Amino acid sequence: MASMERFLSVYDEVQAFLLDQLQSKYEIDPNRARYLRIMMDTTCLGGKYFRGMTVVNVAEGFLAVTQHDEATKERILHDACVGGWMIEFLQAHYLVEDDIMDGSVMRRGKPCWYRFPGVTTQCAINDGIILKSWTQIMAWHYFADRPFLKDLLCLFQKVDYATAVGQMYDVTSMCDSNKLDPEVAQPMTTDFAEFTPAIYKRIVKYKTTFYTYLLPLVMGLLVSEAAASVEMNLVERVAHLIGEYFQVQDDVMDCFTPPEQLGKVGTDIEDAKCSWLAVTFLGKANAAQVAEFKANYGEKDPAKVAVVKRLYSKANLQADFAAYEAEVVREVESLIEQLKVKSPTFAESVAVVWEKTHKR
Amino acid sequence: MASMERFLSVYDEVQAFLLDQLQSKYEIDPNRARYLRIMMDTTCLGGKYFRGMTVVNVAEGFLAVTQHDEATKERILHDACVGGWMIEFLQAHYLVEDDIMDGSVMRRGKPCWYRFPGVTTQCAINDGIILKSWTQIMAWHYFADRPFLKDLLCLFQKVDYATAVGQMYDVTSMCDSNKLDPEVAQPMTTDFAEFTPAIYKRIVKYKTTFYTYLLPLVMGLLVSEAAASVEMNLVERVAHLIGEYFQVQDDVMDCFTPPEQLGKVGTDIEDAKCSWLAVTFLGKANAAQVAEFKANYGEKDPAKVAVVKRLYSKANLQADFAAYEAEVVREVESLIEQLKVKSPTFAESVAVVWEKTHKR
Numbered sequence: 212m213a214s215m216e217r218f219l220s221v222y223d224e225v226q227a228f229l230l231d232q233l234q235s236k237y238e239i240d241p242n243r244a245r246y247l248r249i250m251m252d253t254t255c256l257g258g259k260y261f262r263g264m265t266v267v268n269v270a271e272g273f274l275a276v277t278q279h280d281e282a283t284k285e286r287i288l289h290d291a292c293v294g295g296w297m298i299e300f301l302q303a304h305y306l307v308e309d310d311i312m313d314g315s316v317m318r319r320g321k322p323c324w325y326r327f328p329g330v331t332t333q334c335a336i337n338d339g340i341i342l343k344s345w346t347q348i349m350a351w352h353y354f355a356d357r358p359f360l361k362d363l364l365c366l367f368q369k370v371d372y373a374t375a376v377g378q379m380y381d382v383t384s385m386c387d388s389n390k391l392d393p394e395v396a397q398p399m400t401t402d403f404a405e406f407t408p409a410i411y412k413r414i415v416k417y418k419t420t421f422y423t424y425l426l427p428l429v430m431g432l433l434v435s436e437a438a439a440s441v442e443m444n445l446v447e448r449v450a451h452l453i454g455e456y457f458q459v460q461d462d463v464m465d466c467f468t469p470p471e472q473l474g475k476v477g478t479d480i481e482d483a484k485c486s487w488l489a490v491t492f493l494g495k496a497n498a499a500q501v502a503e504f505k506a507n508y509g510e511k512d513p514a515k516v517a518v519v520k521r522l523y524s525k526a527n528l529q530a531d532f533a534a535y536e537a538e539v540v541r542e543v544e545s546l547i548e549q550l551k552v553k554s555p556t557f558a559e560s561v562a563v564v565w566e567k568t569h570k571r
Numbered sequence: 572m573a574s575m576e577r578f579l580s581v582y583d584e585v586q587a588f589l590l591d592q593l594q595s596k597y598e599i600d601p602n603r604a605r606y607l608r609i610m611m612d613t614t615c616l617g618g619k620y621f622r623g624m625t626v627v628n629v630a631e632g633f634l635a636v637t638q639h640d641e642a643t644k645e646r647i648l649h650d651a652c653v654g655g656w657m658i659e660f661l662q663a664h665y666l667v668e669d670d671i672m673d674g675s676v677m678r679r680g681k682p683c684w685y686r687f688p689g690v691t692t693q694c695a696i697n698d699g700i701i702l703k704s705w706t707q708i709m710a711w712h713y714f715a716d717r718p719f720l721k722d723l724l725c726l727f728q729k730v731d732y733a734t735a736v737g738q739m740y741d742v743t744s745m746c747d748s749n750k751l752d753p754e755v756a757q758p759m760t761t762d763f764a765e766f767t768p769a770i771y772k773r774i775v776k777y778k779t780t781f782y783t784y785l786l787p788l789v790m791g792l793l794v795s796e797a798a799a800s801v802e803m804n805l806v807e808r809v810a811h812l813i814g815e816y817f818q819v820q821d822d823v824m825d826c827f828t829p830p831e832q833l834g835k836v837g838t839d840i841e842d843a844k845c846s847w848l849a850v851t852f853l854g855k856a857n858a859a860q861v862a863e864f865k866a867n868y869g870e871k872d873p874a875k876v877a878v879v880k881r882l883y884s885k886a887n888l889q890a891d892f893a894a895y896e897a898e899v900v901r902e903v904e905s906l907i908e909q910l911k912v913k914s915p916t917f918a919e920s921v922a923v924v925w926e927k928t929h930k931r
């Protein structure tokens with residue numbers, strides 16, 4: 212059976228399970244069950260399922276080299292699908308809540324969930340809570356007797372936490388750290404001293420890389436009972452590297468990809484985000500360019516945003532991007548080679564993850 | 572050592588642990604660690620700690636009748652405190668998010684967290700996420716080798732989920748169920764058909780009782796390795812009963828307790844909440860009273876709210892409250908007696924929980 216059709220069938224099975232359990236154990240009525248079904252579909256479906264399919268892909272790689280009964284192969288693949296859906300649902304939780312937090316308008320060419328007329332922020336915040344709770348309901352139901360349950364829950368938990376910490380790093384990235392204070396409304400930075408590569412790296416490493424690359428890889432390993440076939444420090448290093456490159460690409464697209472292709476109108480400039488573009492621009496600009504950057508960044512005024520975009524163009528950031536890209540290719544290939552020592556199979560799965568990221 | 576001082580010392584220990592772990596493993600800087608410390612204090616401290624002290628109280632009861640080494644007694648009490656703080660932190664998560672969801676202004680005579688000038692909704696939503704993540708970080712750190720870890724995590728998980736489901740029941744309680752639809756903005760009910768005792772019961776049972784009474788009781792049992800000393804169906808029944816009475820009292824106070832004593836200006840009437848008052852009023856009103864209720868309920872206009880309050884006064888709901896109260900005393904005393912068969916000690920802890928609720 213092809214991997215994606217297996218993955219999507221398991222969504223239907225997991226959906227039915229969660230809703231059936233709401234009716235039998237949580238006293239839900241048909242109308243609220245229908246709302247939750249619609250919310251699940253709208254928030255969990257319609258992306259590429261890269262995260263969840265990674266779990267499946269890693270597991271398939273091991274199946275090709277490991278002896279098992281057919282019923283075991285099916286059980287491992289089912290497990291990988293369930294684990295993949297845990298990660299998709301975790302992502303859906305963070306996208307719902309992040310869209311609310313950020314006042315976002317669109318996501319994948321449709322309105323953000325909270326903006327649906329029959330939702331509202333009041334419900335949406337809670338809907339995003341439920342999305343994450345479902346991850347745990349899935350785990351406890353499908354993996355109850357599994358030897359990996361402990362390690363899976365502990366990992367999931369650490370990744371979730373890392374993500375929320377990353378969210379904090381991101382939403383506070385345009386404030387001066389020394390002025391953070393719950394009692395005092397936060398001014399935007401005037402000096403931009405904290406727009407550095409290392410500070411940027413910390414934002415991206417926590418906010419995206421742990422749940423986008425680390426978790427799918429290591430979950431694939433746990434449902435395969437294969438974690439002792441890898442050097443876990445390598446898996447972390449390669450995850451964080453590829454995840455960083457992914458976020459840089461996202462940052463560049465926010466500014467330069469036409470909205471109809473982006474699925475939204477990008478506002479990182481108006482939001483004064485610590486983006487790869489802003490940090491790389493500041494690492495090469497002259498005094499007058501920095502000054503003009505500071506006069507225009509982090510302002511809704513479209514004239515000011517057009518000025519920032521122009522500054523980035525004239526600064527030939529495309530060439531810094533190619534140079535970053537080249538270095539990432541070196542490092543990711545080096546880590547892939549190192550992973551071949553203990554597992555050629557796992558190494559190949561990381562190669563596939565890298566190709567899918569590097570091309571898109 | 573007195574229970575409350577033990578409980579509060581453990582807050583300091585758990586705080587230090589979480590922040591120290593942010594620095595050593597999550598790359599946090601001192602300023603963000605200070606924000607998170609302030610957020611933790613502001614959202615977790617300053618209530619009565621009834622929930623968390625219940626875990627401690629149940630555990631102390633068992634210690635008085637069970638043979639242990641002194642180091643075991645200390646370890647059990649430490650565990651009960653940690654488990655109590657998990658529940659306080661879970662509550663803090665739900666109060667942060669609920670205040671945002673509801674546009675609340677105050678909580679315990681201070682501004683809601685999101686309203687602090689240096690917070691904002693953008694941060695606060697995520698801060699509430701972090702509050703719940705800390706529950707799991709505590710559990711995995713302090714209970715890693717404990718035999719109860721599995722059952723504690725699974726229980727916690729089910730309670731959290733029940734709570735979020737309850738939140739949904741509550742925020743949708745003034746809509747007609749058959750019209751729930753994410754695509755269509757939701758009108759307030761005109762008939763109030765769904766303001767019934769059974770529907771009310773479902774709201775309160777999920778939104779409050781599982782995390783306020785069930786979880787503290789059963790966590791006290793799990794850290795005591797005492798769950799097989801009770802009939803778990805009785806513990807559930809008594810939890811849900813006492814929790815329902817707690818919520819009724821809360822509902823009555825929302826309307827009739829002066830704000831300075833309430834710690835907030837109550838808005839259940841303007842918010843069209845399915846309260847105990849609205850449901851009991853509708854179960855005794857005549858046709859003209861129902862009509863006047865419908866013309867005035869769920870409207871910000873202070874004249875209309877004063878009309879609703881007057882309708883409740885004239886309707887002598889205080890007498891229905893006394894009659895409800897009497898029935899709850901019968902039933903809770905009956906359940907307490909039933910709990911005495913397998914555990915007099917646990918029965919006495921439930922009695923204490925009941926007294927603390929019944930008086931306040």
Ligand SMILES: CCn1cc(C(=O)NCc2ccc(F)cc2)cn1
Binds near residue numbers: 412456531535536
């Ligand atoms: C051009 C060659 N090169 C650039 C770097 C670099 O570290 N850029 C800064 C940066 C920090 C964090 C990120 F996530 C992405 C990028 C390394 N080699």
Ligand SMILES: CCn1cc(C(=O)NCc2ccc(F)cc2)cn1
Binds near residue numbers: 768772775891
């Ligand atoms: C007056 C004697 N009495 C009232 C009831 C009753 O069920 N009231 C409705 C109600 C439903 C749910 C709740 F949580 C609280 C209250 C039972 N005996």
Ligand SMILES: [Zn+2]
Binds near residue numbers: 381
């Ligand atoms: Zn965001």
Ligand SMILES: [Zn+2]
Binds near residue numbers: 462
């Ligand atoms: Zn972006």
Ligand SMILES: [Zn+2]
Binds near residue numbers: 672
């Ligand atoms: Zn609420």
Ligand SMILES: [Zn+2]
Binds near residue numbers: 821822825
């Ligand atoms: Zn209330």
